[PDB]
Amino acid sequence: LGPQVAEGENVFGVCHIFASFNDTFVHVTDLSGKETICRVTGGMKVKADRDESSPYAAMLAAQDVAQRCKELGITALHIKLRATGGNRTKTPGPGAQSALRALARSGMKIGRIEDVTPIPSDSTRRKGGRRGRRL
Amino acid sequence: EETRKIPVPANRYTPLKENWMKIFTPIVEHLGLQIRFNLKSRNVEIRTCKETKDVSALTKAADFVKAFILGFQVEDALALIRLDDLFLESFEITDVKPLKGDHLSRAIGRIAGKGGKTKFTIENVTRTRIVLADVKVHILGSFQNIKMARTAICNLILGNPPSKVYGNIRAVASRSAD
Amino acid sequence: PIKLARVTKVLGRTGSQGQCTQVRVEFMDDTSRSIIRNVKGPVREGDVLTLLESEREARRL
Amino acid sequence: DIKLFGKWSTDDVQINDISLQDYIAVKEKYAKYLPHSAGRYAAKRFRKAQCPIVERLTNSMMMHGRNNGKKLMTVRIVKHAFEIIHLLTGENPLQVLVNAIINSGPREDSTRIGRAGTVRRQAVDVSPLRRVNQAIWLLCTGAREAAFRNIKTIAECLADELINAAKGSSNSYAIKKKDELERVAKSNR
Amino acid sequence: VVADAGAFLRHAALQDIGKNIYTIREVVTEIRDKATRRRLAVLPYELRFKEPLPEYVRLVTEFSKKTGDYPSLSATDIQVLALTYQLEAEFVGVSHLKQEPQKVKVSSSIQHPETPLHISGFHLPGGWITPSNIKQIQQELEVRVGCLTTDFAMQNVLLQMGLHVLAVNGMLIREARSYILRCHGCFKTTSDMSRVFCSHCGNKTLKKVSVTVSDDGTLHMHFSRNPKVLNPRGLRYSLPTPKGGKYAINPHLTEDQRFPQLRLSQKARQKTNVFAPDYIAGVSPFVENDISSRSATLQVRDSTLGAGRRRLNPNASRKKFVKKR
Numbered sequence: 001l002g003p004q005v006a007e008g009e010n011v012f013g014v015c016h017i018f019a020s021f022n023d024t025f026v027h028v029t030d031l032s033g034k035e036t037i038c039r040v041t042g043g044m045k046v047k048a049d050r051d052e053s054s055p056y057a058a059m060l061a062a063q064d065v066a067q068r069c070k071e072l073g074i075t076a077l078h079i080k081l082r083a084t085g086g087n088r089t090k091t092p093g094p095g096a097q098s099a100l101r102a103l104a105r106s107g108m109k110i111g112r113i114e115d116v117t118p119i120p121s122d123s124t125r126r127k128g129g130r131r132g133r134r135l
Numbered sequence: 136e137e138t139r140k141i142p143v144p145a146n147r148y149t150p151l152k153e154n155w156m157k158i159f160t161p162i163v164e165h166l167g168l169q170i171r172f173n174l175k176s177r178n179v180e181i182r183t184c185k186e187t188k189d190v191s192a193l194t195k196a197a198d199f200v201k202a203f204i205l206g207f208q209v210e211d212a213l214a215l216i217r218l219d220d221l222f223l224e225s226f227e228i229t230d231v232k233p234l235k236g237d238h239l240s241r242a243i244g245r246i247a248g249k250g251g252k253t254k255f256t257i258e259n260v261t262r263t264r265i266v267l268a269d270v271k272v273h274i275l276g277s278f279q280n281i282k283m284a285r286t287a288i289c290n291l292i293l294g295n296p297p298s299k300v301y302g303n304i305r306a307v308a309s310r311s312a313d
Numbered sequence: 314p315i316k317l318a319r320v321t322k323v324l325g326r327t328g329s330q331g332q333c334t335q336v337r338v339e340f341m342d343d344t345s346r347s348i349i350r351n352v353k354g355p356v357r358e359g360d361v362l363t364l365l366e367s368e369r370e371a372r373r374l
Numbered sequence: 375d376i377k378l379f380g381k382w383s384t385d386d387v388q389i390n391d392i393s394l395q396d397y398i399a400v401k402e403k404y405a406k407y408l409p410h411s412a413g414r415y416a417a418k419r420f421r422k423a424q425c426p427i428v429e430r431l432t433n434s435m436m437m438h439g440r441n442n443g444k445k446l447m448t449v450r451i452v453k454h455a456f457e458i459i460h461l462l463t464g465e466n467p468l469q470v471l472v473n474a475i476i477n478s479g480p481r482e483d484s485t486r487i488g489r490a491g492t493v494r495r496q497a498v499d500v501s502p503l504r505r506v507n508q509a510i511w512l513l514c515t516g517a518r519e520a521a522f523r524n525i526k527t528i529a530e531c532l533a534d535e536l537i538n539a540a541k542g543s544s545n546s547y548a549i550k551k552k553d554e555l556e557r558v559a560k561s562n563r
Numbered sequence: 564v565v566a567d568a569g570a571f572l573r574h575a576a577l578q579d580i581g582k583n584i585y586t587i588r589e590v591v592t593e594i595r596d597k598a599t600r601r602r603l604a605v606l607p608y609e610l611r612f613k614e615p616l617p618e619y620v621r622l623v624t625e626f627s628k629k630t631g632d633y634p635s636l637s638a639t640d641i642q643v644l645a646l647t648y649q650l651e652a653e654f655v656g657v658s659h660l661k662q663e664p665q666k667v668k669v670s671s672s673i674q675h676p677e678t679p680l681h682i683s684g685f686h687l688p689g690g691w692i693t694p695s696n697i698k699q700i701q702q703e704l705e706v707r708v709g710c711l712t713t714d715f716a717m718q719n720v721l722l723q724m725g726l727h728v729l730a731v732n733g734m735l736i737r738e739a740r741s742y743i744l745r746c747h748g749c750f751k752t753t754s755d756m757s758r759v760f761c762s763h764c765g766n767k768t769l770k771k772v773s774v775t776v777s778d779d780g781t782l783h784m785h786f787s788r789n790p791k792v793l794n795p796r797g798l799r800y801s802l803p804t805p806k807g808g809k810y811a812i813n814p815h816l817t818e819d820q821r822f823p824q825l826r827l828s829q830k831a832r833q834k835t836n837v838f839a840p841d842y843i844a845g846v847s848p849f850v851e852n853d854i855s856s857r858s859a860t861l862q863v864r865d866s867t868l869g870a871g872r873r874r875l876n877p878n879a880s881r882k883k884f885v886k887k888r
């Protein structure tokens with residue numbers, strides 16, 4: 001079940017790895033991105049809200065997605081990394097790095113590593129006050 | 136054979152040139168990856184050849200060279216070569232508190248302290264490496280250690296004096312089964 | 314399952330009261346798998362251990 | 375040929391576990407006529423591994439305070455216990471002693487890590503020298519509480535403890551204590 | 564086939580290619596690296612020690628003063644050069660060799676002296692460092708007697724004479740391109756790339772100039788016709804009054820002025836090595852910093868540290884809230 005491709009050529013999907021500051025999403029989609037293939041959160045692998053954004057949950061998520069994509073015939077993935085963006089922080093967290101490495105171990109050819117974080121041109125006001133944020 | 140390209144700024148060209156042997160030797164010796172530096176595109180290129188021992192070594196080398204470009208020492212990113220459970224988390228200094236001008240500079244000062252001492256103290260307690268780019272903070276360490284270091288740094292850049300931060304991080308490091 | 318062991322290098326004295334010895338372990342199963350383990354009592358270069366279970370790794374990092 | 379107490383052979387003794395083989399010192403050059411030697415054996419670290427194991431059993435038999443200096447009594451009790459072992463089992467009593475030491479010593483033990491107040495223990499491995507030492511100590515202690523207030527002579531009780539530990543049955547004090555220690559260590563990890 | 568200190572320092576297993584293996588005692592006794600001294604106690608002993616009579620040493624000295632490399636070489640370098648000269652005279656005919664070397668010709672270009680050409684990893688527009696090129700990237704690679712020398716100045720004077728030289732590779736070298744430092748006040752050239760004050764006039768004025776030496780005996784020098792090199796922009800600025808004591812750091816105006824001793828502690832100057840077999844036993848991934856010593860409070864730094872700060876011109880604008888040590 002999958003594309004009818006010779007062994008020389010690879011099937012490309014686009015893996016959106018979005019690491020929010022509470023968990024991590026692994027969302028493999030079409031090259032267009034409209035039709036999806038797989039997605040497992042940090043929360044569907046570990047049964048605790050404390051360890052939701054942990055690299056353990058992210059790497060288990062990446063192995064689950066890699067196995068599912070081997071089942072459906074996709075052999076290679078382009079990578080579109082993401083942080084929360086906008087007013088929030090712009091750098092993808094350690095969970096995104098952990099998911100990327102874990103899907104790199106799991107037999108996947110890697111295509112283009114590209115960061116799409118929604119950087120504002122000129123943002124609205126920060127969620128925190130004037131006093132500060134994050135302890 | 137796949138490749139990864141990472142950029143280098145103008146202020147990291149000379150550290151790249153001086154430390155070049157110490158960068159390319161560990162990548163090609165035991166990881167078995169081709170490496171070059173394109174002067175036209177200003178990119179470090181890392182490639183997989185037939186001599187590559189295992190998969191995902193190129194990701195390890197990419198994290199190593201990226202950490203060196205962000206401002207870390209060559210041995211502190213050779214730690215990323217050897218160890219598996221190490222990450223590179225970074226944030227802007229205005230991400231937690233909107234600081235304008237001179238206030239912002241003072242915040243930078245109380246990440247460093249006098250002689251850098253405060254920064255080194257955190258590096259002694261959290262077992263991390265912190266790099267202060269001009270308005271950026273980069274932490275290299277384990278995930279829990281990154282959390283402790285970012286808690287200390289965020290406490291410093293919203294107003295807390297260094298002694299309170301030292302006491303808090305020493306209590307947390309005592310509680311963290313270190 | 315029980316597997317016998319080898320001593321490659323004595324590493325140090327750790328523990329609360331300095332009672333445990335951190336030591337490198339080679340295997341008698343003709344493998345080069347060296348694991349760091351904590352032992353209780355006096356050990357020297359030339360000892361043979363008896364690991365009740367070998368999947369455990371000591372306090373590394 | 376050198377025979378312990380003039381009658382007991384030492385070449386028939388075989389070591390089952392090779393980790394304790396280099397420390398149970400009984401086989402060829404370490405066989406003596408009598409358990410009594412009075413040599414300087416605690417002068418330097420690991421020198422007591424070179425000691426004949428019958429001398430170790432004798433030296434751990436004088437432990438309690440009222441017998442704390444009498445060694446000729448301990449060696450004659452060792453001789454009598456070897457007689458009891460030989461008439462009960464029929465084997466070489468040195469082999470029974472070695473099997474008891476092998477089956478008595480715990481392989482892993484709990485220990486305290488952290489600071490004063492840390493009430494959780496980590497399971498660690500046990501050194502072979504410490505394993506032999508604690509096996510001898512537990513066998514002698516089993517001989518002690520096996521013969522406090524009863525008609526049975528302590529030579530008979532020492533022989534019974536040695537035979538029960540060599541057989542591995544759940545009757546020896548040393549076997550029960552080893553099982554308890556290993557279960558506690560497996561529960562802690 | 565004479566061996567310099569660079570052969571044993573770079574671990575040249577080249578005893579098989581040669582048969583006249585001759586070394587001085589001072590080239591083998593001055594080595595401080597423990598690994599190669601251990602190697603010398605293991606290596607097969609076909610080398611034999613030989614001392615030159617000093618007429619060859621005299622002649623090597625008077626053309627060392629003529630080739631412009633006499634301040635660059637040391638005494639043991641002169642001894643090794645006299646050794647290979649006297650064996651070439653003893654075994655081979657002496658008439659093959661020309662004395663009083665030729666005149667250098669000038670050919671300048673617009674390239675900066677800091678252009679990173681002939682660096683193995685760097686590539687302009689393919690140049691790759693591969694696992695199959697590590698043993699071969701040493702230098703520009705190209706019968707009975709030879710040398711095992713890596714220092715450039717000896718090679719420069721030696722090919723000015725005309726003896727064939729070899730390296731830890733097999734085949735001999737015909738062309739040698741490298742860099743020298745030239746004073747633009749007194750026009751005296753030095754082959755020592757480490758030094759920053761010239762030996763003749765003592766000013767901090769040495770600048771990089773590239774040189775190429777042929778096997779025939781022709782030296783030629785490439786200068787840079789770039790005005791950025793000879794620009795007096797950040798050279799004049801106000802200096803503070805000279806200060807003494809245990810903590811003064813003077814602006815380093817001469818090569819031999821007496822600085823106070825301000826050394827880093829041993830805990831401060833340990834860098835972590837990660838490939839040690841006992842590294843994983845450590846409680847931390849990195850070496851603990853020094854925050855307790857007196858050298859930490861005095862903000863003592865390593866000599867190699869902060870090089871780009873010194874390269875900025877002092878008559879410029881730093882950031883408002885920073886202090887430059």
Ligand SMILES: [Zn+2]
Binds near residue numbers: 747765
């Ligand atoms: Zn000059």
